[PDB]
Design a protein around this ligand. Structure first.
Ligand SMILES: CCCCCCCCCCCCCCCCCC(=O)OC[C@@H](COP(=O)([O-])OCC[N+](C)(C)C)OC(=O)CCCCCCCCCCCCCCCCC
Ligand SMILES: CCCCCCCCCCCCCCCCCC(=O)OC[C@@H](COP(=O)([O-])OCC[N+](C)(C)C)OC(=O)CCCCCCCCCCCCCCCCC
Ligand SMILES: CCCCCCCCCCCCCCCCCC(=O)OC[C@@H](COP(=O)([O-])OCC[N+](C)(C)C)OC(=O)CCCCCCCCCCCCCCCCC
Ligand SMILES: CCCCCCCCCCCCCCCCCC(=O)OC[C@@H](COP(=O)([O-])OCC[N+](C)(C)C)OC(=O)CCCCCCCCCCCCCCCCC
Ligand SMILES: CCCCCCCCCCCCCCCCCC(=O)OC[C@@H](COP(=O)([O-])OCC[N+](C)(C)C)OC(=O)CCCCCCCCCCCCCCCCC
Ligand SMILES: CCCCCCCCCCCCCCCCCC(=O)OC[C@@H](COP(=O)([O-])OCC[N+](C)(C)C)OC(=O)CCCCCCCCCCCCCCCCC
Ligand SMILES: N[C@@H](CCC(=O)N[C@@H](CS)C(=O)NCC(=O)O)C(=O)O
Ligand SMILES: N[C@@H](CCC(=O)N[C@@H](CS)C(=O)NCC(=O)O)C(=O)O
Ligand SMILES: N[C@@H](CCC(=O)N[C@@H](CS)C(=O)NCC(=O)O)C(=O)O
Ligand SMILES: CCCCCCCCCCCCCCCC(=O)O
Ligand SMILES: CCCCCCCCCCCCCCCC(=O)O
Ligand SMILES: CCCCCCCCCCCCCCCC(=O)O
Ligand SMILES: CCCCCCCCCCCCCCCC(=O)O
Ligand SMILES: CCCCCCCCCCCCCCCC(=O)O
Ligand SMILES: CCCCCCCCCCCCCCCC(=O)O
Lengths: 123, 123, 123
């Protein structure tokens, strides 16, 4: 429960996230058309891989999530970090393609990656 | 069972799908060589992400799939939609890179995404 | 256990793998800068998809992994194949982008893909 509770919710978000944004980018791509080209391309793949390792990591301490400890918060903020980070980006075809923005997204993937990873594993 | 039954099968397909097609594209890429360049590149990533969110969504109502309701059919046709959709595409390096074809694939990802997602979640 | 044991470990590796390598490439990309451009781009996506289907396949005989038979070894060497394969590659922006190296990585994905896939499925 506690467990299912966690994963679905994060992912659902995550997947409302990645979902609007995917078809959406598709939809805008053709609609914009071009700068928006990479913009859209761009959203997909950073995010697609935000998710891609989200998926690795979440999905797994998922079904290996024994300890009672509260860790979902990061499942939760890493989402929270990464969304506003893309969203912050968020149209500049010029590099920078990054910023404090992703010092948030990636780097939280990193922190919440790092701890929780190690956590349900070594236990 | 009913459950395992579902996921493996869809994925197996899905993964026979994504699998021939991956090494295959590799194999053809070098063999064609060039137009086939993006063609192959092309197959991977639409499909790679067909799968990528397949994976998100399937995999999860997977292990959160309680209701008796018949929903696998779409696991099943969204595959059925997406394969023939790429396959329909399926060599034009000119945009369009889409069509009624993906009005099928993506959009079923969308429908079968949308309902089943919400379904085992809100329950 | 035996099961959890398996998946986490492979993935952890896999995910220490894909993880250093992702932020890392990011980090080097900006730092190199350019040839390193595709190099880094390059690492991500072969590997990102090494993982991408790893994820499909591992993750699933994962929770459908009944037989006692020893199959983790490949979870294990396919990792072992693929790492040293990228790593072998591993800076040439000239094609070849492949070699005996990936005759290892991909092709083990293939062998260990192929058998274990079929195995916990048909059972
Ligand atoms: C609950 C907390 C108690 C107190 C709350 C009070 C907090 C109030 C914060 C007030 C802030 C004051 C504003 C100063 C900021 C100026 C920033 C700036 O100049 O831009 C930098 C710019 C710099 O831009 P740039 O010029 O480098 O590039 C832009 C791109 N070009 C140039 C191509 C156009 O960086 C960004 O754009 C980042 C975007 C920030 C987006 C912020 C929106 C998200 C905020 C989330 C939190 C909000 C509440 C959610 C709560 C939900 C509740 C559960
Ligand atoms: C943008 C900036 C960068 C962002 C990148 C990523 C984010 C980085 C995160 C960094 C780590 C932050 C550290 C916080 C934790 C440190 C505190 C600590 O250790 O104290 C002990 C811990 C543990 O609790 P305790 O140990 O004090 O309690 C003792 C009770 N016994 C021993 C009997 C069990 O305290 C907490 O952290 C509690 C925090 C709870 C969070 C607040 C919400 C609780 C309510 C739940 C529902 C609320 C709705 C929210 C839903 C959100 C919807 C979107
Ligand atoms: C069981 C049902 C009862 C009745 C079955 C009877 C159904 C019989 C349907 C007969 C159809 C009549 C044909 C008219 C169609 C003409 C289409 C056309 O012109 O092409 C559009 C074209 C338009 O092309 P275009 O010109 O825009 O671009 C092509 C690309 N260039 C130009 C670069 C070369 O679009 C497509 O290519 C789509 C490809 C369609 C592929 C169809 C094969 C898959 C069909 C799956 C179902 C088959 C059975 C599976 C059953 C399994 C059983 C469990
Ligand atoms: C290319 C075009 C776009 C494609 C994109 C994606 C596809 C879009 C899908 C859109 C939705 C379609 C709606 C269909 C459902 C609506 C019907 C409905 O609501 O009625 C009630 C529902 C529910 O059943 P019921 O409620 O009528 O039964 C009552 C019994 N009690 C109450 C006691 C439990 O009926 C059905 O849908 C039954 C359909 C079953 C499907 C037919 C096959 C059954 C046999 C199984 C094995 C067959 C082998 C197949 C293997 C395939 C291999 C590849
Ligand atoms: C335990 C076993 C018992 C015996 C152990 C004894 C084994 C000892 C093997 C000794 C080998 C002798 C060396 C001859 C090889 C020459 C290769 C060559 O020329 O390069 C080809 C080259 C050809 O290069 P190229 O010229 O086509 O392209 C390079 C790119 N450019 C040109 C752009 C610069 O291919 C490679 O680079 C492949 C890289 C190989 C990397 C090997 C390191 C990994 C080895 C893993 C095993 C090690 C132990 C791990 C054990 C862990 C324990 C649990
Ligand atoms: C770079 C080159 C390409 C690489 C690409 C991918 C790799 C390709 C792999 C190809 C397949 C290789 C075939 C090997 C198996 C064939 C042998 C066989 O069938 O015999 C019967 C099998 C089965 O056992 P058995 O059937 O003989 O035992 C009988 C006992 N009863 C019947 C009662 C149950 O034997 C084995 O394979 C045992 C091998 C075990 C592996 C050795 C290690 C065991 C110790 C565990 C801990 C060690 C630490 C290691 C951790 C690693 C850390 C990173
Ligand atoms: N989907 C791509 C995203 C790559 C990307 O957007 N790279 C950014 C940094 S994370 C960059 O600076 N690219 C170089 C460029 O735009 O020229 C991947 O997985 O590699
Ligand atoms: N793998 C790429 C696929 C992108 C792609 O093929 N985009 C299509 C629409 S879905 C397109 O029209 N691209 C613009 C172009 O080809 O110039 C991604 O995930 O973004
Ligand atoms: N992430 C890309 C990787 C594609 C790639 O690196 N292709 C290699 C073979 S696996 C190649 O030879 N590309 C053609 C080129 O570099 O011009 C994908 O998923 O398609
Ligand atoms: C329960 C899991 C939620 C699944 C949503 C999948 C959306 C995919 C985003 C790409
Ligand atoms: C919900 C996530 C929204 C992501 C918006 C990303 C903005 C793109 C910036 C490039
Ligand atoms: C049981 C799951 C089936 C796994 C097949 C994986 C194939 C990967 C396709 C890329
Ligand atoms: C099994 C799926 C086959 C996919 C074929 C895709 C055709 C590519 C069109 C571009
Ligand atoms: C237990 C599973 C291990 C999760 C590590 C995820 C790292 C992601 C790599 C991209
Ligand atoms: C741990 C995996 C390390 C991968 C190194 C890949 C080398 C890139 C070659 C291109």
């Amino acid at each position: 429960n506690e467990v299912l509770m966690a994963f679905t919710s994060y992912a659902t978000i995550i997947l409302a996230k990645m979902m609007f944004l995917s078809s959406a980018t598709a939809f805008q791509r053709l609609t914009n058309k071009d700068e928006k080209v990479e913009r859209v391309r761009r959203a997909h793949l950073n995010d697609l891989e935000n998710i891609v390792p989200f998926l690795g990591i979440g999905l797994l301490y998922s079904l290996s999530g024994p300890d009672l400890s509260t860790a979902l918060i990061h499942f939760r903020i890493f989402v929270g970090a990464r969304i506003y980070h893309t969203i912050a980006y968020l149209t500049p075809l010029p590099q920078p393609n990054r910023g404090l923005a992703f010092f948030v997204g990636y780097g939280v993937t990193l922190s919440m990656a790092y701890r929780l990873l190690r956590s349900r594993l070594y236990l």
